[PDB]
Amino acid sequence: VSTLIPPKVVSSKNIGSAPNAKRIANVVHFYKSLPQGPAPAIKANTRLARYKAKYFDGDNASGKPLWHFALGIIAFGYSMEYYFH
Amino acid sequence: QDLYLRELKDTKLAPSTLQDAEGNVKPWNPPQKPNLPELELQGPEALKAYTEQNVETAHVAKESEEGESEPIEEDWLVLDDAEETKESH
């Protein structure tokens, strides 16, 4: 008999139902987000970090470190091969 | 003119008692004094609704109703109903 008032009732529930769950999921991660490679930490030195940076990095990612390890184990084992036989 | 004067006073005297003089009515027996002034005076009221329209009965306008001073229940119910339909826009 009178005029009910829909057009300003969105205060109680934000428009949409499915994207409401994703709103909180995607709005919160943008605060603590790296602008462009912040704190890359590409430089380190712990007597083995240089080897990791030079060979164990994703830029090369080749089979050369495995061959170097094989050569090193051969060099180490030559001495005890002489010692045993 | 004999063809004129006698017919003239004949056409004057015959309705003289009818209209000019108060001699009821001579040409026809039924009375006219208590018929058109009196019986037919209610004729328009007889054909129409007597004592119902000629009096022009005036009905005072009924007071226009409203929400009947409901400042809590009506507003809350309207808001809840709009909330029910807002999820399915």
> Nearest 5 degrees, angle CA A21-CA A22-CA A23?
90
Q: For residues B21 and A23, what is the distance between their CA atoms, to the nearest angstrom?
A: 107
Q: How many CB atoms lie within 10 A of CB B15?
A: 13
- Resolution limit, Å: 3.5
Number of inter-chain CB pairs under 8 A, A vs B: 23
Give the best residue of B78, B84, B85 to mutate against chain A (max A CB count within 10 A).
B78
The coordinates were experimentally obtained by cryo-EM
Give how far Cα A56 sits from Cα of A47, A51, A52, A64, B80, Å: 14, 7, 4, 10, 63
Q: Write down the residue that tokens 């000019």 correspond to.
A: B20
Q: For residues B13 and B21, what is the distance between their CA atoms, to the nearest angstrom?
A: 9
Whether residue B48 contacts residue B54, with contact meaning beta carbons closer than 8 Å, is answered with yes
Whether residue B82 contacts residue A12, with contact meaning beta carbons closer than 8 Å, is answered with no
DSSP per-residue codes, B13-29: HTTIIIIIS-S--SSSS
Q: Which long-range contacts (CB under 8 A, 24 or more apart) does B59-62 make?
A: none
DSSP per-residue codes, B15-69: TIIIIIS-S--SSSSS-STTTTTTTTTTHHHHHS-TTTTTTT--PPPPPPP-S-S
CB contact under 8 A, B82 and A6: yes
**Cα nearest neighbour of A6 on chain B:** B82
CA contacts within 13 A on the Cβ side of B57: 6
Q: Does B63 touch chain A (CB under 8 A)?
A: no
Q: Does A10 touch chain B (CB under 8 A)?
A: yes
> Nearest 5 degrees, angle CA A34-CA A42-CA A69?
135
Residue type, B43: G
